[PDB]
Amino acid sequence: QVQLVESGGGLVQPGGRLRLSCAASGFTFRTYAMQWYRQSGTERELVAAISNIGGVTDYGDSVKGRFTISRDNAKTTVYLEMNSLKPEDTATYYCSAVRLPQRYWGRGTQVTVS
Amino acid sequence: PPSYVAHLASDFGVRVFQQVAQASKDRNVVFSPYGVASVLAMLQLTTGGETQQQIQAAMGFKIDDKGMAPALRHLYKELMGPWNKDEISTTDAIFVQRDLKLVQGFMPHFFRLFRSTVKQVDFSEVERARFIINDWVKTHTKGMISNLLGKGAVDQLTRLVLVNALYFNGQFKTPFPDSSTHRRLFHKSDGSTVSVPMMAQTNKFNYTEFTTPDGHYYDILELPYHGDTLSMFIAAPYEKEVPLSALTNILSAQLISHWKGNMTRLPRLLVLPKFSLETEVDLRKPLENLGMTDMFRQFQADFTSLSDQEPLHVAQALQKVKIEVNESGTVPEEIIMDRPFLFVVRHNPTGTVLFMGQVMEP
Amino acid sequence: QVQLVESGGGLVQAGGSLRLSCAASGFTFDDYSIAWFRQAPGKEREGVSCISSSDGSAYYADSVKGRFTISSDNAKNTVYLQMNSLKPEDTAVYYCAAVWARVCRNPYDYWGQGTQVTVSS
Ligand SMILES: O=C(Nc1cccc(-c2ccoc2)c1)C(=O)Nc1ccc(Cl)cc1C(=O)O
């Protein structure tokens, strides 16, 4: 029943926009922190992370102020606004819900830029 | 809206607390975010030029602008207005060398906005000047804040000092039973242990959970005070291995209002240590870290609004707070606050963060 | 083009004395507030001495009061810092700054490149 299904990915040209999304189900969304990762024969690197409420956000060094993570707990969704995309950002972007020590993962979404 | 300054003052004050808590890890701290904003707003009128801009940039508003000072006077009579005289008391005061020629006409302007004056003492008689300031602070905190200016804090070269003192002893809306007060172990930052008295009360407590972006979650309770205007917010990590540094380093006055918003009343048995904490905070490093560096530096500070005859700079900027949480006596699932926790006293109608601190060892 | 040129620095034994001079070109020190600053290793730039144009009074930092003197010779368009009984702590880059204000305070209009004062024990 616990499922995190991400969407929104696609192919864009350098400098393009992308709006990620991940529908959640099967657990208490309101109490979990939501995150976003990425991978491509490498390790999964943290990109964004948000607190369950209050809007406390956290980002990796490569994202700078280009990605913004948000959430709508009533609609049980975490978002990722991706602007100013660059060849380094081409990766599979995974979502994840964490209320330690419990973590749930998504299936991923492929983001590719020229 | 008059509540527009209450949020700026509290957002600025909580930011000051973060600098204090960062420098005061493992040590007890009681602090007043509204207090440092109220006295720094007074310092705006005495400064000018670049020094004044550093303050206004960090506080986010100008005391000169229309309605700002009247709103702060309305906010003061708002917090010290519901007959809290025996429960809460504060005082703001700036002290400058007495034979220093001040800008003519500035004091009536300073008085028009704050209904107080900048006080003048002769710092060349060091202990007399230290006594006059300590007596002024003590008589204005109902006798609760003693020796704010410690021996050696000022000498004969001191020319300008800023002091801020607050006492708080608010009674909860529903008292903790004196019979339920028991001795229990408290776990400290270093992993050691100490037995301390803790109150206890089962009730329908306004509660919510809170998880930081890294997955660690927290318990957050609201304890109403008598009068239904003020409340104390308790917050601590669920796991004792997570330091309170994680909470305070992302702390915001806005975040506290989000906690209160997502709260629901649940039947809980709460045990909470009694604490009586008194802290003197040297505001120098915290205010410097927020860009207010000129005011403390000789021949760099711009106090030309207060004096354009001699140079001036802030020798000392000190806040001393004393808070007391007791059973407030009059005539089920558990939450154990047996680890370093954070407390916040809040005026819910205005969102003003009156008090804030960490209990590392009650 | 306004230019301030400090001189007089150098190496001197602890307890020694040195006289710094700052000459002005392109303007005159008259009715400017004048201050000597210094930047020691591991420390910020800190005020050393000040002449406030409001009345010409001299002011000194706590660590140099009674040891240093500041003065201005408008017939020579020069400002001086007499440094007596120097201590190892007095080692710093010493530069002069003028500001068109009644008292010494930031920001300053002009300042020189500075001169090195080194005090050995
Ligand atoms: O403060 C004052 N004068 C003064 C001058 C020099 C030194 C000191 C001083 C006090 C303690 O240490 C030094 C005080 C004063 O006249 N105030 C006031 C006047 C009228 C009204 Cl309506 C209210 C106030 C007030 O302040 O509420």
How many whole angstroms separate alpha carbon B353 and alpha carbon B346? 5
Instruction: Spell out a b/e string for B120-135, using b for 16 or more CB atoms within 10 Å of the CB, else e.
Output: bbebeebeebbebbbe
Please tell me the residue having the least CA distance from ligand 1 atom 22: B115
H-type helices in B274-329, by residue range?
A: 284-289
Token pair in block for residue B238: 């669920």
**Binding-face residues of A in 66-105 toward B, CB within 8 A:** 98-100, 103
Q: What is the DSSP string of B1-61?
A: -THHHHHHHHHHHHHHHHHHHHHTTTS-EEE-HHHHHHHHHHHHHH--HHHHHHHHHHH-S
Partners of A11 in the beta sheet? Answer: A112
Residues A39, A105: contact at Cβ < 8 Å? no
How many whole angstroms separate alpha carbon B99 and alpha carbon B254? 44
B87 in contact with C at a CB cutoff of 8 Å? no
> Which domains does chain C possess?
3-119 (2.60.40.10)
A33 in contact with B at a CB cutoff of 8 Å? yes
How many whole angstroms separate alpha carbon C13 and alpha carbon C120? 5
Residues B177, B241: contact at Cβ < 8 Å? no
Residues B156, B97: contact at Cβ < 8 Å? no
Q: Which residues are within 8 A (CB) of B199 and not within 5 positions of it... i.e. 6 or more apart? A: B176, B180, B181, B271, B272, B273, B274, B326, B327
CA distances from A40 to A17, A45, A93, B44, B45 (A): 20, 10, 9, 54, 58
Q: How far is A103 from chain B (nearest CA, A)?
A: 8
Find the closest chain C residue to B315 by CA distance: C62
| Atom of ligand 1 minimally distant from the CA of B118 | 1
* CB-CB neighbors (< 8 A) of B301 in chain C: 105-106
Residues A60, A45: contact at Cβ < 8 Å? yes
How many whole angstroms separate alpha carbon B166 and alpha carbon B235? 22
| Experimental method, per PDB record | X-ray
Number of domains in chain A: 1
How many whole angstroms separate alpha carbon B9 and alpha carbon B60? 9
* CB-CB neighbors (< 8 A) of C102 in chain B: 304, 308-309
Chains with 3 or more CB pairs under 8 A to chain B = A, C
Token pair in block for residue C121: 């024990």
Q: Which residues are within 8 A (CB) of B323 and not within 5 positions of it... i.e. 6 or more apart? A: B30, B167, B168, B169, B275, B276, B277, B278, B343, B345, B355, B357
Under the phi-then-psi rule, with left for phi > 0, alpha for psi from -120 to 50, and beta for the rest, what region is B4? alpha
How many whole angstroms separate alpha carbon B144 and alpha carbon B316? 21
Instruction: Spell out a b/e string for B192-219, using b for 16 or more CB atoms within 10 Å of the CB, else e.
Output: eeeeeebbbbebebbbbbbbbbbbbbbb
The dihedrals phi and psi of B11, each to the nearest 5 degrees, come to -60, -40
Count other Cβ atoms within 10 Å, centred on residue A21. 16
How many whole angstroms separate alpha carbon B30 and alpha carbon B300? 31
CA nearest neighbour of B228 among B289, B267, B170: B170
**Inter-chain CB proximity C52 and B309 less than 8 Å:** yes
**Inter-chain CB proximity B298 and C47 less than 8 Å:** yes
For B192-307, where are the E strands, in sequence order?
193-211, 217-224, 230-237, 264-273, 275-282
**Inter-chain CB proximity C59 and B310 less than 8 Å:** yes
For C1-121, where are the E strands, in sequence order?
3-7, 10-13, 18-25, 33-39, 45-51, 58-60, 68-73, 78-83, 92-99, 110-111, 115-120
Query: How much distance in Å is there from the Cα of B111 to the middle of ligand 1?
Result: 9
CA distances from C95 to B133, B170, C30 (A): 38, 55, 19
| Atom of ligand 1 minimally distant from the CA of B133 | 12
Instruction: Name the residue range of residue A99's domain.
Output: 3-113
The position carrying tokens 């707990």 is A73
**A–C contact (≥3 CB pairs within 8 Å)?**
no
Instruction: Name which of A32, A57, A58 is nearest B211 (Cβ-Cβ).
Output: A32
How many whole angstroms separate alpha carbon B33 and alpha carbon B9? 8
The position carrying tokens 């429960």 is B87
Q: Is C75 exposed, middle or buried (CB count within 10 Å of its CB: 0-12, 13-18, 19+)?
A: exposed
Residues A26, B185: contact at Cβ < 8 Å? no
C55 in contact with B at a CB cutoff of 8 Å? yes
**Inter-chain CB proximity B299 and C50 less than 8 Å:** yes
Where residue A48 sits, what CATH number does that domain have?
A: 2.60.40.10
Count other Cβ atoms within 10 Å, centred on residue B16. 26
CA nearest neighbour of B336 among B177, B201, B172, B212: B201
Residues B275, B359: contact at Cβ < 8 Å? yes
Helix (H) or strand (E) holding A58: strand A57-59
- Cα B180 to its chain centre, rounded Å, is 30
